[PDB]
Design a protein around this ligand. Sequence first.
Ligand code: BCL
Ligand code: BPH
Ligand code: SPO
Ligand code: SPO
Ligand code: SPO
Ligand code: SPO
Ligand code: SPO
Ligand code: SPO
Ligand code: LMT
Ligand code: LDA
Ligand code: FE
Lengths: 54, 54, 54, 54, 54, 42, 43, 43, 43, 43, 43, 43, 281, 246, 306
Amino acid sequence: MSKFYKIWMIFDPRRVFVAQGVFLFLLAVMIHLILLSTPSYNWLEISAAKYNRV
Amino acid sequence: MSKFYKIWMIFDPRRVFVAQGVFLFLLAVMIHLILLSTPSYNWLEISAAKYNRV
Amino acid sequence: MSKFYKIWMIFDPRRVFVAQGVFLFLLAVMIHLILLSTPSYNWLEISAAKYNRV
Amino acid sequence: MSKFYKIWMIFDPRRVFVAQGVFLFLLAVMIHLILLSTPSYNWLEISAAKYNRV
Amino acid sequence: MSKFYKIWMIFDPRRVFVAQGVFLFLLAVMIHLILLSTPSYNWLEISAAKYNRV
Amino acid sequence: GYTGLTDEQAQELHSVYMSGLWLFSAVAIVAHLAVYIWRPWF
Amino acid sequence: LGYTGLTDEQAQELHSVYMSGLWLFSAVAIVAHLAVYIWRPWF
Amino acid sequence: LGYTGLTDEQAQELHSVYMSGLWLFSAVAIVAHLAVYIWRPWF
Amino acid sequence: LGYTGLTDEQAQELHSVYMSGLWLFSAVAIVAHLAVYIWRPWF
Amino acid sequence: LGYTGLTDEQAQELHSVYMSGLWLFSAVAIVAHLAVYIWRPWF
Amino acid sequence: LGYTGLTDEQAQELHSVYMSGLWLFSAVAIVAHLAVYIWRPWF
Amino acid sequence: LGYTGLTDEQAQELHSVYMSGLWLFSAVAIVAHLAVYIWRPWF
Amino acid sequence: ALLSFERKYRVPGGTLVGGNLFDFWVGPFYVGFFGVATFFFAALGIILIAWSAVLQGTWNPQLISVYPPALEYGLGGAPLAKGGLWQIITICATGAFVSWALREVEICRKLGIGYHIPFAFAFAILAYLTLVLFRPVMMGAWGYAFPYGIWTHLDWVSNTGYTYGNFHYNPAHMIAITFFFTNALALALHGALVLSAANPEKGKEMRTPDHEDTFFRDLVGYSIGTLGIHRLGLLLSLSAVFFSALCMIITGTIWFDQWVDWWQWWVKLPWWANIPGGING
Amino acid sequence: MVGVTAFGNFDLASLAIYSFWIFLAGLIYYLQTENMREGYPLENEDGTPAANQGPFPLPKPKTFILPHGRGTLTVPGPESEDRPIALARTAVSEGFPHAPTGDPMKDGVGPASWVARRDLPELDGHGHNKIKPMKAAAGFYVSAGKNPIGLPVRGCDLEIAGKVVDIWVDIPEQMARFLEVELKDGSTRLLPMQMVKVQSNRVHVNALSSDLFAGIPTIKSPTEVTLLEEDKICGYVAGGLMYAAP
Amino acid sequence: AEYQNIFTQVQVRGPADLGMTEDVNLANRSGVGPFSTLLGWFGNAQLGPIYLGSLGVLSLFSGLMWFFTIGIWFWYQAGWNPAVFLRDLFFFSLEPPAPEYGLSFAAPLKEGGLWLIASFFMFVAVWSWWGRTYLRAQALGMGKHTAWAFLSAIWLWMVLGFIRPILMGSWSEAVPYGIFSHLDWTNNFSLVHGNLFYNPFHGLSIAFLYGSALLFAMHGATILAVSRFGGERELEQIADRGTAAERAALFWRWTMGFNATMEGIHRWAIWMAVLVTLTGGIGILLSGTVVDNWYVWGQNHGMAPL
Ligand code: BCL
Ligand SMILES: CC[C@H]1c2cc3[nH]c4c(c3C)C(=O)[C@H](C(=O)OC)c4c3nc(cc4[nH]c(cc(n2)[C@@H]1C)c(C(C)=O)c4C)[C@@H](C)[C@@H]3CCC(=O)OC/C=C(\C)CCC[C@H](C)CCC[C@H](C)CCCC(C)C
Ligand SMILES: COC(C)(C)C/C=C/C(C)=C/C=C/C(C)=C/C=C/C(C)=C/C=C/C=C(C)/C=C/C=C(\C)CC/C=C(\C)CCC=C(C)C
Ligand SMILES: COC(C)(C)C/C=C/C(C)=C/C=C/C(C)=C/C=C/C(C)=C/C=C/C=C(C)/C=C/C=C(\C)CC/C=C(\C)CCC=C(C)C
Ligand SMILES: COC(C)(C)C/C=C/C(C)=C/C=C/C(C)=C/C=C/C(C)=C/C=C/C=C(C)/C=C/C=C(\C)CC/C=C(\C)CCC=C(C)C
Ligand SMILES: COC(C)(C)C/C=C/C(C)=C/C=C/C(C)=C/C=C/C(C)=C/C=C/C=C(C)/C=C/C=C(\C)CC/C=C(\C)CCC=C(C)C
Ligand SMILES: COC(C)(C)C/C=C/C(C)=C/C=C/C(C)=C/C=C/C(C)=C/C=C/C=C(C)/C=C/C=C(\C)CC/C=C(\C)CCC=C(C)C
Ligand SMILES: COC(C)(C)C/C=C/C(C)=C/C=C/C(C)=C/C=C/C(C)=C/C=C\C=C(C)\C=C\C=C(/C)CC/C=C(\C)CCC=C(C)C
Ligand SMILES: CCCCCCCCCCCCO[C@@H]1O[C@H](CO)[C@@H](O[C@H]2O[C@H](CO)[C@@H](O)[C@H](O)[C@H]2O)[C@H](O)[C@H]1O
Ligand SMILES: CCCCCCCCCCCC[N+](C)(C)[O-]
Ligand SMILES: [Fe+3]
């Protein structure tokens, strides 16, 4: 389990980082979108009602 | 039940790891999206009812 | 029956496993989705009725 | 009658084995879909009535 | 986290900087428009209500 | 000779092909017998 | 014959391991189906 | 055989690493399923 | 020796830099979840 | 490695400048967030 | 006559095997029709 | 580093002139924002 | 004012009418016998549209419309202020289009090339003649043709379409729309593929048609070829217009009701018309 | 934000429609100037540069590198019809036709024109010859259609002019390019496939008549055709529709 | 009769063209498939080989899941009857969630939940195919015009299904997965926004759909006309201008008064086609978000009498 470094002798580093970077951005946006969509976790609305702004 | 290591003498390691990685990503999201669709397992809505939120 | 090992001498092992892997997953996804559609076996809804989650 | 092996001196075994496998699975799913549609053999809905799950 | 300088021995500086510029600008414009939509954080409307400009 | 096999190669191959064929039909007969007991169609 | 280039000795090694995975796959399937039938039988 | 050129030394070393991650991934999934079952069972 | 023309010592160094950035990304994420969970738990 | 043509010193030279801009860009961002949270907190 | 590359011996044994299969298929057909006629006669 | 061919003397000379224009444009913007803010502040 | 290679191509001949009476170039344009006809018909029709504007009382170009004669006039003449001007402009437009197509034939003969271009333009003309002449003649009045306004000829399209419900359900409409979408998709692929070959990555040799086949075989597993793509582009557009004119020559002359009801012939086929379930059963 | 206008009726939809007019004007300028890389600057009827060059300025040169060490083409650049144009103007004024000073097909004018291209064969990506006779290309056969080999070749005068000897094929494209036709003189000429009509019992050439096949330009190698020879052959044959159908 | 070069009268077939390996990973490229005589009457006869790499696996498997998800919903909607499935194939539809849920993901699988699952598979499949379109050009050292032209069509695709429904605040604004279903959506989209004909960008988008049809008929007819001079090989005409390019240019010079080059006509072609979906995306994104009635907006902007 301490030989995972050998994955870099198989996959090209230039391709893994691009594949990983695209995936992490779209995963972060996807989860942030779900939280905003649900009114229970929409933090912009939570503060709006907490401080009686609208 | 031990000679399965020979499968890497037949199948390209690069293709196999990519197909397996694609499969798990698509499978994981589909199951997570199913649980959100079912109102009895939507963990965002479950906490809203429990903690008296929107 | 003991001579079934000659199928690989005819069919490419690489092509058979790809065709079989896509076959089984779509067969398994189809069968789960049929049980999910039928109210008598939708285990997500059966548990909800049992534990009064809806 | 005991001379049918000579069909394989006419037809490529690879195209027959592929065509037969496609044919049989398509035939089998078609019959299973005919039985699901007919309500007197819908074993999913037959079992619901027998154990009064609905 | 001291060897991160070696990422530039993998990725062309020209392509990285342009990609970040598009990403960083689009991200900021997205967040600014997301705030401008929400009436609670719309700083142009808040000033009007605070100073009674309508 | 269109497929390029010999005469004995076809004999060997067809022997296995029938071996699988009778295996498939044996399961099919058992499958059809089990259903007829459960719910006959005749 | 030998469309795939596998020798007779190599084909036996491939098929023997292939069946090992097949039987392992079905054994999980048999236990899975047995668990479901005890839980909610369909017959 | 000989479709990829990986030796037995390479195949054993590739399988050993891959199967190591399989149990690491399967263990995390098992804990997650056990955790969810305690919180909210589905059977 | 590989599929990508990377020596083992080169792979040893590259993986060490990668896992360093992965612990950093993971540790910051754990703080984010821990802060959000205390602020507003989802369980 | 070395797929870009930059030497070792050049990557050191480029990174030191890139990190300088990154901290300079982040320092303004933190003050920008600090001002906004004081004026109108979102938590 | 030609047109395919067969011979007198090749066509005769091709017909002998083919026609035997034709009677084998009709052997099943007669039995199936006879059982159906006993069950639900159409005449 | 020769992506464009500037010889580290043109780049210093070019960057000095660019920053001279950059500070001038920022200087006029600051005056304009200070004029608008005194006119009617947005905070 | 000639292209650097144009001197050896300006020779006398290949004129259907005349031969030297109207065999010259005015600037770059070739003035044939039908160039004189095209200019007269193009110019008269334009000034009539300008004149119809003053009768209408507007100068906004987007509001100018020439309406066909009302449905009460049937298939005869009309007053100029009502719909007579439309009939002159339609004649002028019909004369200008056919002269333009005929003038292109003289250019093809003088350059010694094939007549694919004038043939393809006649497909546009036949589609236009279907809407203003053939279809109104069948239906019985000139008032079914579209008016000559920038935004009012859209009102004719909208009003005619909704006479038969949603026009999407016209089966020949669906075929024609499919050809239009395929033609634009192939045009994007064809322009991009040739440009990428002529303009490679950077500091690279110009690619070859062997790279063009290889790119599309790598991508979608097939390549129609350099000759095939040009035959396809011509045939997709001619097919798109053919089924365009087909769908309107059958609307209001053979089919009169909602186009949605047409598709009930399939859903009411005798062998599955009564099977319960689904959307229609 | 429906109905929000910065001024008058200028809302976000007006900003979009007006921004497109500006973008389209810039695009039309770009697309037109990228099409002034051949045939410019404009000449007078005799060869001198014209006094009018048009609203659009010439673009800046671009270099095309050629795929097999064939050089660098820069456009727009110096241009010349590198050949003896044999024409005499029919009028002193401009805009009038130019009459040939002799036989038009041989002299290469009018619809029988040709361009002085590179006098080398066209090469595929492997560097070989793109066009070569079928008996030299290996493995090439007539997969479908009437094999037009051995059929007589009939001209536009309904007289036989020869019979087909071979087919020149495009190796990478895998399509027939020319028909090699042997004349009664014993020599061989190339006829482009687009100009022939292969019928069930003959090949009909509508362009040329019978007593013009001997005038088709010949090729300097029996198994190799160059761009200069292709342009002379194709230009000569297609020029017969006008100068050789009287 | 006269040969119009629309069908190949003679077909010639040789060794299978395996393509050129500029930087292509030759392992991923498959073997040459069959030869079609029917396709040979119109273009090339050779099918394959096809490059199926890493983005090919992701796109083909995601595209399979999108296609298979919609199919199973149609079998459910048919009551698992093969005849009813055949009968009502053009009437079945997978619909987005009801407008009561807004953009939330808490809709039941029968009320817009499977739509979200199928939509995710389509999102991955289409975007991965754009990456594959980009990477296939790069391995051959070619320009990226195909990738960026495809990005124009993806723009309208993302506006219809993702961007606008986010801006409108509900997934119910998006397009249902069906044959007659998405035609009804198109018809109803115009009626809700007041005669989409008066959208200036729908009008422009149509100008380039007709312009593409006009331009490909012109260009395709021009090349077949000068194909007798070796005009079909446009790539070698660019390198060394021949009599085909001069006659093609001089036809449109004498007809229209202006012409193009052999390379510049393909810049007209690519730019005319990308504006069909580039302009369409803006017009669709402006509908409801900025304008909720295009006939009334038109009346205030000329375009229509008061
Ligand atoms: C009554 C209905 C309305 C109307 C309502 C609409 C609506 C709504 C829309 C249009 C749109 C358009 N309309 Mg309209 N339209 C009307 C009248 C017309 C008339 C006419 C003569 O009356 C015409 C010619 C048009 C034509 C047009 C086009 C200009 C434009 C579509 C561009 C396009 O190609 O998108 C099609 C291309 C795409 C959608 C991109 C697809 C690319 C994706 C990424 C590929 C996915 C592939 C998929 C997964 C399948 C894979 C299969 C395997 C690979 C094999 N309309 C009337 C007035 N119209 C569209 C537009 O944008 O205009 C503003 C649009 O949304
Ligand atoms: C058939 C396939 C497609 C096609 C092909 C095609 N079009 C062609 C050609 C070809 C092959 C030409 O060779 C020819 C040409 O030279 O193009 C540059 C042409 C052409 N297609 C044109 C336009 C055009 N094509 C269209 C469509 C299509 N053309 C098809 C989709 C459309 C659409 C869909 O609206 C238009 C507008 C021109 C650019 C040109 C023909 C020019 C011409 O006819 O010149 C002589 C006439 C005039 C100068 C104008 C006369 C004006 C009238 C006297 C008055 C106005 C009448 C008009 C009906 C008013 C309209 C009012 C409102 C409806 C706006
Ligand atoms: C709709 O129906 C639903 C979806 C609800 C139900 C359907 C369910 C279905 C069909 C489920 C199917 C499930 C399946 C088939 C699951 C299979 C899962 C598997 C096989 C997971 C395997 C995971 C293995 C992993 C993650 C291994 C990872 C290994 C590494 C990360 C190490 C890699 C590093 C290496 C190899 C370096 C070595 C290199 C050298 C040179 C030694
Ligand atoms: C609509 O109708 C419904 C769907 C409801 C009903 C219809 C049902 C139907 C038609 C069902 C059809 C079912 C069928 C035909 C199922 C067939 C299933 C099979 C054949 C499953 C076989 C599985 C075998 C497996 C998973 C084996 C896996 C083995 C491995 C992973 C080991 C890998 C191989 C190695 C390591 C070989 C190594 C040796 C060398 C030399 C490399
Ligand atoms: C709906 O979803 C929302 C938007 C609400 C939530 C989603 C949030 C997400 C997904 C946020 C993602 C945020 C991310 C990924 C942030 C990452 C930010 C980073 C990495 C910023 C780094 C910035 C660094 C900069 C700007 C550095 C610039 C450097 C310079 C300006 C110096 C110039 C560099 C030179 C001169 C190097 C040249 C070479 C030599 C040799 C000198
Ligand atoms: C709508 O109208 C209705 C349906 C109501 C009524 C109309 C009915 C009509 C028109 C029915 C028409 C029926 C017809 C024409 C039936 C014909 C049936 C025949 C001739 C069937 C023949 C079958 C022959 C078979 C199955 C032969 C099989 C042969 C084999 C299995 C042997 C395999 C062959 C080998 C091994 C080749 C030997 C090779 C060598 C080298 C010796
Ligand atoms: C809706 O969202 C809102 C708008 C509310 C929020 C969005 C906020 C955003 C996107 C903010 C972004 C702001 C940014 C990034 C602003 C950047 C401003 C910059 C970089 C301004 C720079 C100005 C520099 C100038 C004007 C320099 C001019 C230089 C000259 C005029 C002199 C030219 C000198 C030369 C050519 C040097 C020649 C020397 C040699 C040796 C040849
Ligand atoms: C027997 O048949 C079988 C079962 C074997 C297979 C048959 C399959 C069949 C019958 C398939 C039928 C397919 C049809 C009719 C497809 C029609 C598709 C159409 C008309 C699509 C039209 C428009 C679709 C659009 C514009 C989709 C846009 C989607 C996006 C832009 C991305 C969507 C992503 C969203 C909404 C968010 C997803 C994100 C998360 C986190 C869930
Ligand atoms: C051609 C490309 C370049 C275009 C010109 C460059 C500037 C681009 C922005 C121009 C914006 C101004 O454009 C101008 O906007 C005002 C705003 O209501 C319009 O509106 C004005 O006339 C209209 C129509 O009679 C009235 O309904 C309206 O009450 C009146 O305010 C003008 O009709 C338009 O001409
Ligand atoms: C609609 C106009 C049709 C005109 C067709 C062109 C003329 C064809 C006849 C040209 C030759 C006539 N003539 C007398 C020289 O034989
Ligand atoms: Fe072209």
